Amino acid sequence: HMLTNLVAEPFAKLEQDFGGSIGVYAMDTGSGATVSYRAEERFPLCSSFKGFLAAAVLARSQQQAGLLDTPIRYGKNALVPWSPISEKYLTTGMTVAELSAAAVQYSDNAAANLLLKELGGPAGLTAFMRSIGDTTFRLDRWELELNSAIPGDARDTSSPRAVTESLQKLTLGSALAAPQRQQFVDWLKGNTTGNHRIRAAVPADWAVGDKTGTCGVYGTANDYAVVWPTGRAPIVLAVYTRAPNKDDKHSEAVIAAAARLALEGLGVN
Ligand SMILES: C=C1CS[C@H]([C@H](NC(=O)/C(=N\OC)c2csc(N)n2)C(=O)O)N=C1C(=O)O
Ligand SMILES: C=C1CS[C@H]([C@H](NC(=O)/C(=N\OC)c2csc(N)n2)C(=O)O)N=C1C(=O)O
Secondary structure, eight states: OOOHHTTHHHHHHHHHHHHHHEEEEEEETTOOOEEETTTTEEEGGGGHHHHHHHHHHHHHHHTTTTTTEEEOOOOGGGGGGSOTTGGGGTTOEEEEEHHHHHHOOOOHHHHHHHHHHHSHHHHHHHHHHHTTTTTTOOOOOOOTGOOOOOOOOOOOEEOOHHHHHHHHHHHTTTOOOHHHHHHHHHHHTOOOOTTTTGGGGTTTTTTTEEEEEEEEETOOOEEEEEEEEHHHHHEEEEEEOOSSSOOOOOHHHHHHHHHHHHHHHTTTT
16 A cells, blocks of 8 residues: 555656556565556556457467467458558468467457457457456457547456456466466567567566557557566556547557556565
């Protein structure tokens, strides 16, 4: 409770300057210390649901040994805006594992919808999150409609706290079997879209796995990550933003600054 109080005023100043709302939850898995700022409020998931989507795929692959290497063929109608990987394999298809890595590491939208189909749609991903004890997460729509980020709309949202709690269960806890857990971590470590967010806030020698989200409207963007200080227990954190006007721009610098404040509050230099 006191760590949250240490950074309450700096967080309020950061979000005042940003012109919107910032939600942060961070947990030191070594001490159990946490820092919260609007951590239980709902923010749009945007692209960040794709990390949990890949985790749900891995969970299913624990029972279906052939799932990850199953080839998925798709037509041009499957390609939606921002499919930088899947468009290069339109004429060949890709495996479920390749689609998952593309959804995580490039935010590939065609890949994300194809995987959602394999899981039974937004309700199927929501069901997976319930199965690990997350009662907050909800996915309701497909790409790209899920990015509307409408103020007050609970569709396709979660809270920073629930995002962090579910991330910890999947990457460090027992929600996935050990081989699948390491694959999820490896996919997150290989993300290419987050160099200016949580990654910009940590020392160069720390290992980081993250998944970003960018709705493109309402100043709504986010990032969640597991970070490993060298020789120390990992930290799990989530930073989500939104703003009142549709034309309001998101800020990667604000996300990185919020991550820095969270780590400062936890006392990790
Ligand atoms: C934030 C969203 C959610 S997706 C929705 C939709 N738009 C598209 O699916 C789209 N092109 O559709 C011609 C698109 C999304 S990203 C890109 N490069 N293109 C719609 O027109 O209703 N609208 C918005 C919004 O911007 O307000
Ligand atoms: C950094 C990226 C790459 S672009 C990807 C994508 N988002 C959009 O193309 C988008 N605005 O991007 C400025 C959008 C969607 S609807 C609308 N009106 N705008 C996605 O939704 O996956 N996401 C992220 C990420 O942070 O992972």
